[PDB]
DNA sequence: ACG
DNA sequence: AGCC
DNA sequence: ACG
DNA sequence: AGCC
């Protein structure tokens, strides 16, 4: 699938931030009304320190049937720095995306979207590139304040940055920690919560798109 | 300082567990009545993957004055496996301990004590070796159930393993995550909570013994 | 789930 | 713990 | 404090 | 994420 190379990836940390502050102004938070059909999930495993393995899984909704799965194994140069995950995992994801045949209605990333220091989490960032609605689903908090939701199956709270709602915390599985959901691009808080709740099956903590992308990222790595 | 080499460290994972199940029966949970004077804190940093740097800091209580500081830089063979931290960080700590001149009244370790699958966290394990009262203070949960304490300076809850109290969770600093305190050897839950509360200064999340051992483990590593 |  |  |  |  195609996309817009909005900028260079070979940037020193301090420069990436500058970029982030410019790209955030181009983000569009908008309702995603309707039932999506093709939903994608993205993730990366790391066979080596400087070697990543990105996987994208396209699912058929509401059947959750796997329709396509592409992957790209490559070098990872940029280090991990909270708030700059995009500059680390972004490039390899895009290379796997160049291999993607079916155009997704929505893409789910294993990371923050709006719930980010500069309001441009890896999900928002990629959305600008691929120009498709995106959602970020992280397994831990990066930014924002919240009241821990009850330990009940669909309990949830809002993630805040002061008075602004930047995402939500959903208990998708009792006994397990909540997940952090936030809009990427062409998405808003209410719609990302609705969609993520619809993409998560009973008994699972992680919504199908990213849950499967992860397993694949791990199976491909190992045997 | 001296200690008892109770067993070999070069053990395969499955064997270490066996050892743990035998050593746990020798643990003595007993009150630590009274004001201690010399309190030690232990920690390790890792200059390389197979290279550790252990530091032990002895403090004067209740002044928190540093009285002694010894360290040992060495190879780390055993990998990290939750529940077997002792087989990884234990050996190098003991080598630093062999260098220790002042005998501590109590030793605080950066890890679990009783709050462990086999009731023998690294703090309990070392206590058997050094035959001195020990306490474990971890920054995250390894085993047990608990109700998150209020976000207030001295708020705390009990850590459970069913009906058994195996430690406590203390909010030592509002806005920061709680710490997990559990008795090692020659210690009990009530006394370890009392002592750890006394060893933690206002505004700090980590009690002085281990807070200082950590900084040193990091400074020595770097410049 | 898990320094 | 270790990738700033 | 922070995949 | 990666050390089973
Ligand atoms: Mg991931
Ligand atoms: Mg430590």
């Amino acid at each position: 699938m195609d996309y817009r190379q909005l900028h260079r990836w070979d940037l020193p940390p301090e420069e990436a931030i500058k970029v982030q502050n410019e790209l955030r102004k181009k983000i569009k938070l908008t309702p995603y009304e309707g039932e999506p059909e093709y939903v994608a999930g993205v993730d990366l495993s790391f066979p080596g320190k400087e070697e990543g393995l990105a996987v994208i899984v396209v699912l058929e909704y509401p059947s959750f049937k796997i329709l396509e799965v592409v992957s790209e194994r490559g070098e990872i140069t940029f280090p991990y720095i909270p708030g700059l995950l995009a500059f680390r995992e972004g490039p390899l994801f895009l290379k796997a995306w160049e291999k993607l045949r079916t155009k997704p209605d929505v893409v789910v990333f294993d990371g923050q979207g709006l719930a980010h220091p500069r309001k441009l989490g890896i999900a928002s960032h990629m959305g600008l590139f691929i120009e498709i609605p995106t959602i970020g689903v992280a397994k831990s908090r990066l930014y924002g304040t919240f009241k821990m939701p009850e330990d009940k199956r669909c309990s949830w709270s809002y993630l805040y940055d002061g008075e602004e709602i930047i995402g939500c915390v959903i208990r998708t599985k009792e006994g397990s920690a909540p997940i952090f959901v936030s809009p990427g691009h062409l998405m808003d808080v209410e719609s990302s919560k609705r969609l993520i709740k619809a993409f998560t099956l009973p008994g699972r903590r992680i919504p199908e798109p990213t849950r499967l992308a992860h397993i694949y990222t791990q199976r491909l790595k190992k045997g």
Side-chain angles (χ1 to χ4, degrees), chain A:
Chain A
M1 190 72 279
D2 60 302
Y3 71 83
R4 286 179 175 297
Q5 186 58 45
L6 297 178
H7 61 90
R8 311 158 48 198
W9 291 113
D10 55 358
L11 298 178
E14 171 192 50
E15 279 310 307
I17 296 183
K18 311 302 190 62
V19 173
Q20 291 186 314
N21 280 305
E22 190 178 359
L23 289 175
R24 58 186 290 185
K25 300 187 298 185
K26 305 173 73 176
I27 285 288
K28 268 51 184 175
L29 299 183
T30 52
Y32 181 97
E33 318 294 53
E35 225 66 21
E37 169 166 33
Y38 300 134
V39 188
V42 184
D43 201 21
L44 279 68
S45 60
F46 300 79
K49 186 184 183 185
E50 304 183 5
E51 188 170 10
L53 160 32
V55 163
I56 299 179
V57 178
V58 183
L59 295 188
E60 209 295 294
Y61 181 83
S63 54
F64 288 108
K65 210 80 177 185
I66 286 181
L67 294 179
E68 172 167 43
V69 178
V70 300
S71 54
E72 181 80 332
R73 199 152 182 285
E75 178 182 54
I76 297 295
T77 66
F78 209 91
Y80 175 67
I81 302 170
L84 292 169
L85 181 56
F87 291 79
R88 176 176 175 78
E89 309 191 324
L92 192 62
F93 147 67
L94 292 169
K95 296 237 283 192
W97 180 267
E98 283 162 38
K99 301 178 172 187
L100 199 59
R101 195 172 202 298
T102 89
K103 190 182 179 182
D105 292 317
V106 50
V107 183
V108 181
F109 293 84
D110 182 23
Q112 315 295 322
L114 219 206
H116 175 284
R118 293 167 291 291
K119 307 267 166 289
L120 194 74
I122 191 166
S124 311
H125 203 144
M126 294 305 96
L128 287 176
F129 270 55
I130 62 172
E131 277 159 341
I132 292 184
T134 59
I135 300 168
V137 174
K139 300 179 291 310
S140 58
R141 192 194 61 94
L142 167 68
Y143 181 79
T145 56
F146 76 100
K147 159 196 53 193
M148 181 67 57
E150 291 163 296
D151 198 355
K152 177 191 172 64
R153 220 293 210 187
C154 290
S155 209
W156 62 274
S157 290
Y158 276 129
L159 231 197
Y160 292 96
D161 178 355
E163 323 291 304
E164 193 205 329
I165 292 177
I166 60 183
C168 64
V169 195
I170 308 167
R171 195 126 238 166
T172 52
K173 180 176 183 294
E174 288 171 50
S176 297
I179 59 172
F180 299 72
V181 178
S182 55
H185 183 51
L186 300 175
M187 182 68 61
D188 65 0
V189 178
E190 230 48 47
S191 303
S192 55
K193 166 158 58 73
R194 172 177 77 72
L195 287 169
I196 299 304
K197 283 184 173 184
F199 301 161
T200 310
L201 284 24
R204 337 237 60 162
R205 182 203 174 196
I206 311 293
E208 291 307 299
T210 274
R211 194 180 68 76
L212 295 169
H214 181 243
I215 287 157
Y216 281 139
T217 202
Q218 297 298 311
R219 287 213 209 308
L220 285 173
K221 186 176 60 178
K222 303 177 179 182

